[PDB]
């Protein structure tokens, strides 16, 4: 529909009606100009008196000045409403857009979304501002012209109005012929270029067999076919421009001859004929203009509907739960959970998993690197609904507490921790506002990132310039872990990548203080088994099915798929 | 450097001179005829008689008919020259491109070259086909018309030459102000949008912290800061259109009033003024046209100097090798060769390794499994020169052999085999002239491919449609090695990829029965270590340095990195 587009201009109707009013005034001025112009000319040819004084001044003053001023203020306020429309529409789209489930982001590509945002906002703002504007302008203009044609000479207007459609018909016929042939030429050239691209793509395989000059040969054959196609459309353009020229010639000279007959036979004055042919040329101009812009308008309105499908798409789950205790004990428990991805409901990435989390201890879990390993991390952040089971915190599920309080109480670090084009003091508390300097530097010293913080060109409050391309792996690792710790959450989750460029320093730091002294159930998903030797409670599952639990010496008491992996990886 | 563009227009001089001639006569007709139109109106004011219409028609018939005739001829000829020049440039550039060394495609991109083979070639054809055309047309037209108006009335000529620079100056300075303002608006818009882009591009983390409302806040804050400036921009546009309209108004009415006074002064007939105003009219049209074209012309000549960056570019590898015996035995050897890439000479991948290959036997090799040992296959296929040592073939260096003959003798398979959008028998009998079809049948037997091809839509004459995306990679490797076997290669290159998810009996038959029972000296690389059983001469390396040789039975003794990797497989 377009009723949404109707509704999204309601606080702008004052500017709209003032714009349309001034538009109609400029229209009446522009169409009133030529008849008085011709009266002045019929003075300057027939009655060479000082009525030309009067006619010339009335030609200039009200007509030209009013038309110019009206057009100017019209375009000005149209640019105003263009700005206001773009602002409000872009703001509302972005405000709606971020409030959706993650599955929406998994389904749709990202660059498509931002291209949709920017390009289509500009497209629909151009649609309201420019195309509709000049369309209405030219239509009221041409209606005024044909009004003057039926007022001046019904004879002459009937002649030109049986004339003009013949021109339009033959021009459309031969132009469609021409454009179709040129499109065929474009298609064949595209075909040959696609062949050449497919050759040059994996071309080392071709160099394995030395076929290259034959690829040149077949390319040349395709191009020769293109050539023989092209001669015909050359002849077509020839014929088209021939016909158009001869037709406009014969109709124009018939106009002039019959008008001369009418004026010398004493039917209308000469200035009437003058104004008449003036109006014919301006009519042709306006008709060509509207015929040009109609297709661009159609493209715009076709582009418009891509926005509204996401303007008000209903999200599935809302953060309706609201609870914020002053503190907690940090008791987390799993309960026979059977999550699956919503995007592909065939599989079973989780099946009936239950385990508690000890307040204070360090719970550990490593998968077989093929099954569900990086999924509980998505469970614990309410990023999805769950199929079976229900995960509670302190007896209450995630749908009980406040969402912002939930993010306040539990942090998260990824394996590829992205940052923002901001300063460090910005990026250290990306979420939490109202932070003091001293807590940040204290946590950074606890983060052991403080070294490569201070040695920089601006040290503490430097900025992640060139889109943050001035750090490395272990750097942003320490940065993100600081970004975790600055909130001081009662519960932390840590799972890092396979590289782990920290030379055992950060692990010494956590198992010095942040694994024992910091009373937080810090669940660890680990790769490279560098921490399975040192933990508090270790489990391992495949797709939902646990094979081993307990402390790692029970894992040593039964090394089934525990010891086999660690003996494999040295 | 532009004489290069001359250096390819050379075989087209006849079409060029004909086109220029017809362009010239068209322009001359166009610049003549309105003066005689003014002569006709001079008759309509005074000699309204039989001499009127005679003169009128004998002017307009010859003039307009010759104009449209020559214009049609000119358009057709420039169409033909566009086609011919585009064909010649595309063929020559694509031909010279493929003969470049492999390191070029290694360093250079792919889609950039496709752009360079389609779009800018189209652009450089558009240069000589359109921009030169309309530029020359309009400049000779403006010279002709300024000659006529200078010939008629030097007084009003001086009026026009005092007027038009004022219009052009004020329009240029105000449009510069305007365009600077609008570009400021657009840049601020992009600067505001990229923040939301950064949010939405990695929104998992901010959703993990729930600050999207603050993002919307700072977003609309930026956008308000934008539209405050946009107000000033629009006001400036209003002042621009005001000034342009007012100035053109006042200069035009001054021209008309002075012309009326000079007509009543009697020295100037009416038709003189008629010619003056009409010719002034086209002048403005022509000035509009040249101001439109000049920028796109500069764009085209800028795009033009990218195809000559490579169309005359020297190859870096000679291909003077000519040895081609009737048959060969195939003791390919090495001589302590070392190698690094030409991108970075410090990064070494090969250091001083030599080993022979006994003809007619199966010989495999796996290095440290970390080095890109496929570099050995690359130095087999003569894709690069070598720094140290030398590689030969049966006593003769691999260079001196004929290039096509070399690639005929030794075959190759990749890891991910690629194919074209041709029929499979064409994809099989690819780099070789029309060898009969029963050999393809024999290969499909030997590849064990004869079965599954019968379960296609046609069988043999079928084509791998949908841009080649309908077969699994197992049969892809199957048909790839089938492509090798139709060549009847004496020496063979084989390297199965990491998956090897096929029926796997074809692999042991490859080790034993497929090629191993014939004169097929085959070199094998493998990830799946099921091949290490069936072997004769296992060589193992590290960082391009040989450590062991002989059978794997000797490697049972020297299990260092061998037996370490045997159990690493399990």
């Amino acid at each position: 529909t377009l009723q949404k587009l109707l509704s999204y201009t309601k606080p702008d109707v004052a500017f709209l009606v003032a714009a349309s009013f001034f538009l109609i005034v400029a229209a009446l001025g522009e169409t009133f100009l030529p008849y008085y112009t011709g009266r002045a000319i019929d003075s300057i040819v027939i009655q060479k008196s000082m009525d030309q004084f009067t006619t010339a001044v009335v030609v200039v003053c009200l007509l030209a000045i009013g038309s110019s001023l009206a057009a100017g203020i019209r375009g000005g306020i149209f640019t105003l409403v263009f700005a206001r429309l773009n602002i409000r529409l872009r703001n509302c789209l972005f405000r709606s857009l971020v409030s959706q489930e993650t599955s929406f982001f998994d389904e749709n590509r990202t660059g498509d979304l931002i291209s949709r945002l920017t390009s289509d906002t500009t497209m629909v703002s151009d649609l309201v501002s420019q195309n509709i504007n000049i369309f209405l302008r030219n239509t009221v203009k041409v209606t005024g012209v044909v009004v003057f044609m039926f007022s001046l000479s019904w004879q002459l207007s009937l002649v030109t109005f049986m004339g003009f459609p013949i021109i339009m018909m033959v021009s459309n016929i031969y132009g469609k012929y021409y454009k179709r042939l040129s499109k065929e030429v474009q298609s064949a050239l595209a075909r040959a270029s696609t062949t050449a691209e497919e050759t040059i793509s994996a071309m080392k395989t071709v160099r394995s067999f030395a076929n290259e000059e034959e690829e040149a040969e077949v390319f040349l054959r395709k191009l020769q076919q293109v050539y023989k196609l092209n001669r015909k459309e050359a002849a077509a353009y020839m014929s088209y421009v021939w016909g158009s020229g001869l037709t406009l010639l014969v109709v124009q000279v018939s106009i002039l001859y019959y008008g001369g007959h009418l004026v010398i036979s004493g039917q209308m004055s000469s200035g009437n004929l003058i104004a008449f042919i003036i109006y014919e040329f301006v009519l042709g101009d306006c008709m060509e203009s509207v015929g040009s812009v109609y297709s661009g308008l159609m493209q715009g309105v076709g582009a418009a509907e891509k926005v509204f499908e996401f303007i008000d798409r209903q999200p599935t789950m809302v953060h309706d739960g609201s609870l914020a205790p002053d503190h907690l004990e940090g008791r987390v428990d799993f309960e026979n959970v059977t999550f699956t991805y919503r995007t592909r409901p065939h599989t079973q990435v989780l099946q009936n998993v239950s385990f508690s989390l000890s307040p204070g201890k360090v719970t550990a879990l490593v998968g077989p690197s093929g099954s569900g390993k990086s999924s509980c991390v998505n469970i614990l952040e309410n990023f999805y609904p769950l199929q079976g089971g229900r995960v509670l915190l302190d007896g209450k599920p995630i749908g009980a507490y406040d969402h912002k309080y939930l993010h306040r109480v539990i942090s998260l670090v990824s394996q590829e921790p992205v940052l923002f084009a901001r300063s460090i003091t910005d990026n250290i508390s990306y979420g939490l506002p109202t932070v003091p300097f001293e807590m940040v530097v204290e946590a950074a010293q606890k983060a052991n990132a403080h070294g490569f913080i201070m040695e920089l060109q601006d040290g503490y409050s430097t900025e992640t310039g060139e889109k943050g391309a001035q750090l490395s792996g272990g750097q942003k690792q320490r940065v993100a872990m600081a970004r975790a710790l600055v909130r001081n959450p009662p519960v932390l989750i840590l799972d890092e990548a396979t590289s782990a460029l920290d030379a055992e320093s950060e692990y010494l730091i956590q198992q010095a203080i942040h694994g024992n002294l910091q009373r937080h159930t810090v669940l660890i998903i680990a790769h490279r088994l560098s921490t399975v030797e040192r933990a508090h409670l270790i489990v391992v599952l495949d797709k939902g099915r646990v094979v081993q639990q307990g402390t790692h010496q029970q894992l040593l008491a039964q090394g089934g798929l525990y010891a086999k992996l660690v003996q494999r990886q040295m | 450097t532009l004489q290069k563009l001359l250096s390819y227009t050379k075989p087209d001089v006849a079409f060029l001179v004909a086109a220029s001639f017809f362009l010239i006569v068209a322009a001359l007709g166009e610049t003549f005829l309105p003066y005689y139109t003014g002569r006709a109106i001079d008759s309509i004011v005074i000699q309204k008689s039989m001499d009127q219409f005679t003169t009128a028609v004998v002017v307009v018939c010859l003039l307009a008919i010759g104009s449209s005739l020559a214009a049609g001829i000119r358009g057709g000829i420039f169409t033909l020259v566009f086609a011919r020049l585009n064909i010649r440039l595309r063929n020559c550039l694509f031909r010279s491109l493929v003969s470049q060394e492999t390191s070029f495609f290694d360093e250079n991109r792919t889609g950039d070259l496709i752009s360079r083979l389609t779009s800018d070639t189209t652009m450089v054809s558009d240069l000589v086909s359109q921009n030169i055309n309309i530029f020359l047309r309009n400049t000779v037209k403006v010279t002709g018309v300024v000659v006529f108006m200078f010939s008629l009335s030097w007084q009003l000529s001086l009026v026009t030459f005092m007027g038009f620079p004022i219009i052009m100056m004020v329009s240029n300075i105000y449009g510069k102000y305007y365009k600077r303002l609008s570009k400021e608006v657009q840049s601020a818009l992009a600067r505001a949008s990229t923040t939301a882009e950064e949010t939405i591009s990695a929104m998992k983390t901010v959703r993990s912290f729930a600050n999207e409302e603050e993002e919307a806040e700072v977003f609309l804050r930026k956008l308000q800061q934008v539209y405050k400036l946009n107000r000033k921009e629009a006001a400036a546009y209003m002042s621009y259109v005001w000034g342009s309209g007012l100035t053109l108004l006042v200069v035009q009415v001054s021209i008309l009033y002075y012309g009326g006074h000079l007509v009543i002064s009697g020295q100037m007939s009416s038709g003189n003024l008629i010619a003056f105003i009409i010719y002034e009219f086209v002048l403005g049209d022509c000035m509009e046209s040249v101001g439109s074209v000049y920028s796109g012309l500069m764009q085209g000549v800028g795009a033009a100097e990218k195809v000559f960056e490579f169309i005359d570019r020297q190859p870096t590898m000679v291909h003077d090798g000519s040895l081609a015996p009737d048959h060969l035995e195939g003791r390919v050897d090495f001589e302590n060769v070392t190698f690094t890439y030409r991108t970075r000479p410090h990064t070494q991948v090969l250091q001083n390794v030599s080993f022979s290959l006994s003809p007619g036997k199966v010989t495999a090799l796996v290095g440290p499994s970390g080095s890109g040992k496929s570099s050995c296959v690359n130095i087999l296929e003569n894709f690069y020169p070598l720094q140290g040592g030398r590689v030969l073939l049966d006593g003769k260096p691999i260079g001196a052999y004929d290039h096509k003959y070399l690639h005929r003798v030794i075959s190759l398979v990749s890891q991910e085999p690629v194919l074209f959008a041709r029929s499979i028998t064409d994809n099989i009998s690819y780099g070789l002239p029309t060898v009969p079809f029963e050999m393809v049948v024999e290969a499909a037997q030997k590849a064990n491919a004869h079965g599954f091809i019968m379960e296609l839509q046609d069988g043999y004459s079928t084509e791998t449609g949908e841009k080649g995306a309908q077969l699994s990679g197992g049969q892809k490797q199957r048909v790839a090695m089938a492509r090798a076997l139709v060549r009847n290669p004496p020496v063979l290159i084989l390297d199965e990829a990491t998956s090897a998810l096929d029926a796997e009996s074809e692999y042991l038959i490859q080790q034993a029965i497929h090629g191993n029972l014939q004169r097929h000296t085959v070199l094998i690389i493998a990830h799946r270590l099921s091949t290490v059983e069936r072997a004769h001469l296992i060589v193992v390396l590290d960082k391009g340095r040989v450590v062991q040789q002989g059978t794997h039975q000797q490697l049972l003794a020297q299990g260092g990195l061998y037996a370490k990797l045997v159990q690493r497989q399990m």
């Binding site: 149209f78 640019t79 040009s292 661009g296 | 439109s292």
Partner: peptide, 9 residues
């Protein structure tokens, strides 16, 4: 022959 018109309001 031009392709598309200029930008104006």
């Amino acid at each position: 022959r031009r392709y598309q018109k200029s930008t104006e309001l």
